[PDB]
Amino acid sequence: GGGPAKEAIMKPQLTMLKGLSDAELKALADFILRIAKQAQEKQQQDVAKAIFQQKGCGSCHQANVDTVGPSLAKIAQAYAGKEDQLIKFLKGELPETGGGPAKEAIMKPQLTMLKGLSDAELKALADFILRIAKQAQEKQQQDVAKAIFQQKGCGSCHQANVDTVGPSLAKIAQAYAGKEDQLIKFLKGELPETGGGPAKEAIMKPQLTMLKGLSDAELKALADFILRIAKQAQEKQQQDVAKAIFQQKGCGSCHQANVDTVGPSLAKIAQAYAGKEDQLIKFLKGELPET
Amino acid sequence: GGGPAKEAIMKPQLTMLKGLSDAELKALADFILRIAKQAQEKQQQDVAKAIFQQKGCGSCHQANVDTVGPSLAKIAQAYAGKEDQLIKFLKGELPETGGGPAKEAIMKPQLTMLKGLSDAELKALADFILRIAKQAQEKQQQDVAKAIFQQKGCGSCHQANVDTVGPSLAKIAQAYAGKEDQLIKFLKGELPETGGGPAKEAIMKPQLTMLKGLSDAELKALADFILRIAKQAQEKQQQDVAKAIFQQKGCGSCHQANVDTVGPSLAKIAQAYAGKEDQLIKFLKGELPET
Ligand code: HEC
Ligand code: HEC
Ligand code: HEC
Ligand code: HEC
Ligand code: HEC
Ligand code: HEC
């Protein structure tokens, strides 16, 4: 899109990208398509967290355990698919979803703490209430799994995205795709290897001893980690590469994430290239006109 | 909202809905929020199927079996996340994702059959190529599972959404949520029933003999059916109730699904009430003056 004046501003900047590899251009294109939403979500989560802390809500609302008040996981369950009612509740405009009069009288005055918040702040806070418990739980489980993986020495033979003495965690995740129950049974010593020969089988078999005595919850977290960490590590590495290119080449001078300046925001670019990442890459190579 | 002239047109029509239950109003609200997209998707899929059939593509492309050409399932895998490229290929603008030069020369002239299609028709055709194999496979598995359920007599004690001699399929689906592996093990006779008292357990235990002789694939289809059919039947029942209300009360005289007439399209209404279904229900019962 755009007219000739804007075209002439951006066209020279494509020279900054000469000599980038196809992998770097893919990483950069991914970053352009996805960073504005990630930045906006982080900014709103930070606003919500600051309100939640400042108003004292955590005194009675822990993420995944009940105290004087219900956990945020339980609140999220009560308002599943009903975020607009959660916002109305926080404004004092809807009754409690359940409970009796004693609990109602505990929570009712605390709604005073939210008077004078803007609609955008209430929206961010409602988003946070609906989502933070699952995010906290997933981080707790991943930390448990990472600690087991390190303490038992699995990484010596299992890197995230490269083969060594053993297969990469990416290859393991491929072998167990949609078969997490079988991965847990394998880690318990209850199923044979998915493939390979006897030599590889003999290397890995004694290492299963390192997992005896783990609880079912620990094995579940470890299995989740094995299935998911390679892609998470690869995405982080690619985003770091892209961010470094974006900074080094000066693109941020005209492209903020969610505000227009000399150039369009990255959110507006992402909308222009929605479902057309192949075209974004070709544009970055100087091979396609402005949208 | 809308103004005085428009509000005066619609306001009397809410009298049509006096006498509806809360459940009927919920079904009607769901229908208003979802029917325009459902109808649009059905129209697009019908257009794509007609093109695929009339241009002869099926002669070499079966849904889930290779013949002269790759199966639609294989094409869908190759173009996963690359729909824009699929459309460009169908337009004659991109070479083949692989294969030898001989197979490339077989397919290349067939693209002239797509000359004259609109961008919208090509998008519908690409959608169809990406989705139809999975859709056909799911329908085949559900038909197999329904036939087993009916021929083995399970419905004598298991209705979809009401308890009889045995629990409803909705209650079974709740008990096995996220535990389909355990449901398959149970159907095989390998896990003694969780616990409804020894009397209830002894009613169901002999019926597991009905399933001896099923393949693993048939048991998986049956387990899928048990987990999903109650919600599917409930949604169909609610949609049928809502469609009948919408037709009998005359709402379609002014509300078409995807085009504006005297009143806004159902697509516009759905966008206005996105995430605000509770406000839509209150509007329909006349308990909430109009925007
Ligand atoms: C100010 C001097 C800019 C710098 C530095 C960079 N860009 Fe830019 N960009 C700028 C303008 C004024 C526009 C709009 C141009 C138009 O003709 O409308 C753009 C546009 C883009 C786009 C979108 C292209 C499209 O087809 O819509 C992209 C993907 C883009 N710019 C990327 C980009 C990168 C990676 C940069 C650093 C190498 C960069 N821009 C620098 C202004 C400026
Ligand atoms: C202890 C003194 C509390 C503090 C401080 C806050 N809340 Fe609370 N909350 C508390 C109780 C005992 C309950 C249950 C109330 C009931 O009637 O059952 C709640 C409930 C909530 C809910 C759920 C509302 C629903 O309809 O289910 C929410 C969304 C909620 N509380 C939010 C909230 C916020 C944002 C707070 C800081 C301003 C806060 N609470 C403080 C107890 C206590
Ligand atoms: C090198 C001495 C290893 C260490 C330390 C660990 N593993 Fe391993 N692993 C290794 C090999 C050579 C193989 C291939 C085995 C084969 O027979 O082909 C594996 C395989 C796995 C798998 C895949 C199992 C499958 O069925 O495909 C998993 C899930 C696995 N290994 C996990 C794992 C864990 C959790 C470890 C720390 C306790 C661990 N491995 C250590 C080599 C080595
Ligand atoms: C047999 C005479 C064919 C008919 C009729 C159609 N197609 Fe085909 N198709 C055929 C072959 C042998 C191949 C593989 C070619 C190769 O180079 O490997 C294909 C491939 C496709 C693809 C995949 C393209 C890709 O880049 O992977 C698509 C999307 C496709 N064919 C679509 C298609 C349509 C829409 C047809 C009717 C107009 C059609 N094909 C007819 C063989 C034959
Ligand atoms: C009446 C004579 C029944 C027929 C015919 C079938 N089932 Fe049944 N089923 C029945 C009862 C009374 C119960 C509850 C038993 C209890 O211990 O509480 C059940 C239970 C099931 C379940 C749930 C298993 C669980 O662990 O919760 C399933 C999945 C089930 N039944 C499936 C099923 C199928 C597939 C049948 C046809 C082969 C079938 N049942 C027949 C009573 C009766
Ligand atoms: C023509 C005489 C109509 C008939 C019959 C029905 N509706 Fe209607 N509707 C009509 C107009 C002109 C408008 C716009 C009103 C405005 O203020 O701009 C509407 C609006 C609606 C809406 C949206 C309300 C909102 O707040 O946006 C809904 C949900 C709606 N109408 C539903 C509806 C139903 C269920 C009807 C049959 C009982 C029905 N309408 C009849 C015009 C006409």
PDB file of N, CA and C in Angstrom, chain A residues 236-282:
ATOM      1  N   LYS A 236      12.865 -19.132  20.846  1.00  0.00           N
ATOM      2  CA  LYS A 236      13.619 -18.104  21.561  1.00  0.00           C
ATOM      3  C   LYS A 236      14.899 -17.739  20.820  1.00  0.00           C
ATOM      4  N   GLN A 237      15.633 -18.741  20.333  1.00  0.00           N
ATOM      5  CA  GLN A 237      16.881 -18.454  19.635  1.00  0.00           C
ATOM      6  C   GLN A 237      16.629 -17.659  18.360  1.00  0.00           C
ATOM      7  N   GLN A 238      15.610 -18.044  17.589  1.00  0.00           N
ATOM      8  CA  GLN A 238      15.304 -17.302  16.369  1.00  0.00           C
ATOM      9  C   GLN A 238      14.846 -15.878  16.676  1.00  0.00           C
ATOM     10  N   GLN A 239      14.050 -15.692  17.736  1.00  0.00           N
ATOM     11  CA  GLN A 239      13.595 -14.341  18.056  1.00  0.00           C
ATOM     12  C   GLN A 239      14.757 -13.460  18.508  1.00  0.00           C
ATOM     13  N   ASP A 240      15.721 -14.041  19.228  1.00  0.00           N
ATOM     14  CA  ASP A 240      16.920 -13.299  19.607  1.00  0.00           C
ATOM     15  C   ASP A 240      17.714 -12.871  18.378  1.00  0.00           C
ATOM     16  N   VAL A 241      17.895 -13.782  17.417  1.00  0.00           N
ATOM     17  CA  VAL A 241      18.574 -13.431  16.171  1.00  0.00           C
ATOM     18  C   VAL A 241      17.855 -12.277  15.485  1.00  0.00           C
ATOM     19  N   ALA A 242      16.528 -12.361  15.406  1.00  0.00           N
ATOM     20  CA  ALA A 242      15.762 -11.346  14.692  1.00  0.00           C
ATOM     21  C   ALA A 242      15.844 -10.000  15.402  1.00  0.00           C
ATOM     22  N   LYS A 243      15.668 -10.003  16.726  1.00  0.00           N
ATOM     23  CA  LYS A 243      15.764  -8.769  17.497  1.00  0.00           C
ATOM     24  C   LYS A 243      17.117  -8.099  17.295  1.00  0.00           C
ATOM     25  N   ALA A 244      18.191  -8.895  17.269  1.00  0.00           N
ATOM     26  CA  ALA A 244      19.529  -8.345  17.086  1.00  0.00           C
ATOM     27  C   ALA A 244      19.675  -7.681  15.720  1.00  0.00           C
ATOM     28  N   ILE A 245      19.152  -8.321  14.669  1.00  0.00           N
ATOM     29  CA  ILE A 245      19.170  -7.726  13.332  1.00  0.00           C
ATOM     30  C   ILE A 245      18.353  -6.441  13.311  1.00  0.00           C
ATOM     31  N   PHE A 246      17.145  -6.491  13.869  1.00  0.00           N
ATOM     32  CA  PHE A 246      16.260  -5.328  13.877  1.00  0.00           C
ATOM     33  C   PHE A 246      16.922  -4.138  14.562  1.00  0.00           C
ATOM     34  N   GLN A 247      17.593  -4.379  15.697  1.00  0.00           N
ATOM     35  CA  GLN A 247      18.302  -3.301  16.388  1.00  0.00           C
ATOM     36  C   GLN A 247      19.525  -2.833  15.602  1.00  0.00           C
ATOM     37  N   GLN A 248      20.364  -3.776  15.154  1.00  0.00           N
ATOM     38  CA  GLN A 248      21.603  -3.412  14.473  1.00  0.00           C
ATOM     39  C   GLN A 248      21.327  -2.622  13.202  1.00  0.00           C
ATOM     40  N   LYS A 249      20.251  -2.953  12.494  1.00  0.00           N
ATOM     41  CA  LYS A 249      19.990  -2.272  11.231  1.00  0.00           C
ATOM     42  C   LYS A 249      19.219  -0.967  11.398  1.00  0.00           C
ATOM     43  N   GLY A 250      18.775  -0.631  12.607  1.00  0.00           N
ATOM     44  CA  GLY A 250      18.125   0.643  12.854  1.00  0.00           C
ATOM     45  C   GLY A 250      16.652   0.703  12.525  1.00  0.00           C
ATOM     46  N   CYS A 251      16.002  -0.447  12.300  1.00  0.00           N
ATOM     47  CA  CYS A 251      14.611  -0.465  11.850  1.00  0.00           C
ATOM     48  C   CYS A 251      13.671   0.191  12.855  1.00  0.00           C
ATOM     49  N   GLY A 252      13.987   0.102  14.148  1.00  0.00           N
ATOM     50  CA  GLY A 252      13.139   0.675  15.180  1.00  0.00           C
ATOM     51  C   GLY A 252      13.032   2.184  15.124  1.00  0.00           C
ATOM     52  N   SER A 253      13.941   2.846  14.404  1.00  0.00           N
ATOM     53  CA  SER A 253      13.884   4.298  14.285  1.00  0.00           C
ATOM     54  C   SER A 253      12.566   4.762  13.676  1.00  0.00           C
ATOM     55  N   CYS A 254      11.971   3.951  12.799  1.00  0.00           N
ATOM     56  CA  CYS A 254      10.716   4.291  12.140  1.00  0.00           C
ATOM     57  C   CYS A 254       9.608   3.283  12.394  1.00  0.00           C
ATOM     58  N   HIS A 255       9.877   2.213  13.134  1.00  0.00           N
ATOM     59  CA  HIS A 255       8.902   1.140  13.325  1.00  0.00           C
ATOM     60  C   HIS A 255       8.852   0.805  14.811  1.00  0.00           C
ATOM     61  N   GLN A 256       7.930   1.442  15.529  1.00  0.00           N
ATOM     62  CA  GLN A 256       7.575   1.024  16.872  1.00  0.00           C
ATOM     63  C   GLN A 256       6.572  -0.119  16.802  1.00  0.00           C
ATOM     64  N   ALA A 257       6.422  -0.822  17.921  1.00  0.00           N
ATOM     65  CA  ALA A 257       5.599  -2.027  17.911  1.00  0.00           C
ATOM     66  C   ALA A 257       4.126  -1.698  17.693  1.00  0.00           C
ATOM     67  N   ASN A 258       3.599  -0.700  18.416  1.00  0.00           N
ATOM     68  CA  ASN A 258       2.158  -0.469  18.417  1.00  0.00           C
ATOM     69  C   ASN A 258       1.785   1.004  18.261  1.00  0.00           C
ATOM     70  N   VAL A 259       2.687   1.836  17.748  1.00  0.00           N
ATOM     71  CA  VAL A 259       2.354   3.216  17.404  1.00  0.00           C
ATOM     72  C   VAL A 259       3.004   3.554  16.071  1.00  0.00           C
ATOM     73  N   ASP A 260       2.309   4.360  15.272  1.00  0.00           N
ATOM     74  CA  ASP A 260       2.851   4.834  14.003  1.00  0.00           C
ATOM     75  C   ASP A 260       3.797   6.004  14.247  1.00  0.00           C
ATOM     76  N   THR A 261       4.922   6.009  13.533  1.00  0.00           N
ATOM     77  CA  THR A 261       5.841   7.139  13.584  1.00  0.00           C
ATOM     78  C   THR A 261       6.139   7.556  12.148  1.00  0.00           C
ATOM     79  N   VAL A 262       7.413   7.679  11.776  1.00  0.00           N
ATOM     80  CA  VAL A 262       7.729   7.894  10.364  1.00  0.00           C
ATOM     81  C   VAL A 262       7.210   6.731   9.530  1.00  0.00           C
ATOM     82  N   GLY A 263       7.324   5.514  10.056  1.00  0.00           N
ATOM     83  CA  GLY A 263       6.803   4.347   9.388  1.00  0.00           C
ATOM     84  C   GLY A 263       5.646   3.755  10.161  1.00  0.00           C
ATOM     85  N   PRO A 264       4.933   2.827   9.532  1.00  0.00           N
ATOM     86  CA  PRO A 264       3.824   2.159  10.211  1.00  0.00           C
ATOM     87  C   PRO A 264       4.310   1.320  11.380  1.00  0.00           C
ATOM     88  N   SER A 265       3.415   1.119  12.341  1.00  0.00           N
ATOM     89  CA  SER A 265       3.727   0.242  13.454  1.00  0.00           C
ATOM     90  C   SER A 265       3.914  -1.193  12.965  1.00  0.00           C
ATOM     91  N   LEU A 266       4.623  -1.977  13.771  1.00  0.00           N
ATOM     92  CA  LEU A 266       4.772  -3.387  13.439  1.00  0.00           C
ATOM     93  C   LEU A 266       3.431  -4.106  13.514  1.00  0.00           C
ATOM     94  N   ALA A 267       2.509  -3.622  14.348  1.00  0.00           N
ATOM     95  CA  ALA A 267       1.166  -4.195  14.352  1.00  0.00           C
ATOM     96  C   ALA A 267       0.479  -3.984  13.004  1.00  0.00           C
ATOM     97  N   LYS A 268       0.636  -2.794  12.413  1.00  0.00           N
ATOM     98  CA  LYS A 268       0.029  -2.537  11.110  1.00  0.00           C
ATOM     99  C   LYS A 268       0.706  -3.344  10.009  1.00  0.00           C
ATOM    100  N   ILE A 269       2.028  -3.523  10.089  1.00  0.00           N
ATOM    101  CA  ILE A 269       2.713  -4.364   9.107  1.00  0.00           C
ATOM    102  C   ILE A 269       2.233  -5.805   9.225  1.00  0.00           C
ATOM    103  N   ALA A 270       2.098  -6.301  10.457  1.00  0.00           N
ATOM    104  CA  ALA A 270       1.633  -7.669  10.649  1.00  0.00           C
ATOM    105  C   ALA A 270       0.239  -7.864  10.061  1.00  0.00           C
ATOM    106  N   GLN A 271      -0.626  -6.855  10.176  1.00  0.00           N
ATOM    107  CA  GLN A 271      -1.951  -6.982   9.581  1.00  0.00           C
ATOM    108  C   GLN A 271      -1.869  -6.990   8.057  1.00  0.00           C
ATOM    109  N   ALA A 272      -0.964  -6.188   7.486  1.00  0.00           N
ATOM    110  CA  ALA A 272      -0.814  -6.160   6.035  1.00  0.00           C
ATOM    111  C   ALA A 272      -0.301  -7.489   5.498  1.00  0.00           C
ATOM    112  N   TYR A 273       0.475  -8.227   6.292  1.00  0.00           N
ATOM    113  CA  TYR A 273       1.053  -9.478   5.817  1.00  0.00           C
ATOM    114  C   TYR A 273       0.426 -10.699   6.476  1.00  0.00           C
ATOM    115  N   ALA A 274      -0.751 -10.537   7.081  1.00  0.00           N
ATOM    116  CA  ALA A 274      -1.440 -11.651   7.720  1.00  0.00           C
ATOM    117  C   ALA A 274      -1.644 -12.798   6.738  1.00  0.00           C
ATOM    118  N   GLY A 275      -1.168 -13.984   7.113  1.00  0.00           N
ATOM    119  CA  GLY A 275      -1.300 -15.148   6.261  1.00  0.00           C
ATOM    120  C   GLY A 275      -0.474 -15.103   5.000  1.00  0.00           C
ATOM    121  N   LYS A 276       0.436 -14.141   4.886  1.00  0.00           N
ATOM    122  CA  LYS A 276       1.254 -13.928   3.692  1.00  0.00           C
ATOM    123  C   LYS A 276       2.718 -13.752   4.067  1.00  0.00           C
ATOM    124  N   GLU A 277       3.220 -14.590   4.978  1.00  0.00           N
ATOM    125  CA  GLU A 277       4.607 -14.443   5.412  1.00  0.00           C
ATOM    126  C   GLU A 277       5.591 -14.669   4.269  1.00  0.00           C
ATOM    127  N   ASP A 278       5.258 -15.552   3.327  1.00  0.00           N
ATOM    128  CA  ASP A 278       6.124 -15.732   2.163  1.00  0.00           C
ATOM    129  C   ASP A 278       6.291 -14.426   1.400  1.00  0.00           C
ATOM    130  N   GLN A 279       5.236 -13.614   1.334  1.00  0.00           N
ATOM    131  CA  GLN A 279       5.349 -12.337   0.639  1.00  0.00           C
ATOM    132  C   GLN A 279       6.178 -11.347   1.447  1.00  0.00           C
ATOM    133  N   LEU A 280       6.073 -11.393   2.783  1.00  0.00           N
ATOM    134  CA  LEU A 280       6.911 -10.524   3.605  1.00  0.00           C
ATOM    135  C   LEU A 280       8.387 -10.815   3.379  1.00  0.00           C
ATOM    136  N   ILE A 281       8.758 -12.094   3.329  1.00  0.00           N
ATOM    137  CA  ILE A 281      10.157 -12.442   3.090  1.00  0.00           C
ATOM    138  C   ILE A 281      10.614 -11.919   1.732  1.00  0.00           C
ATOM    139  N   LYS A 282       9.789 -12.110   0.700  1.00  0.00           N
ATOM    140  CA  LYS A 282      10.156 -11.622  -0.630  1.00  0.00           C
ATOM    141  C   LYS A 282      10.252 -10.100  -0.660  1.00  0.00           C
TER     142      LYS A 282
END
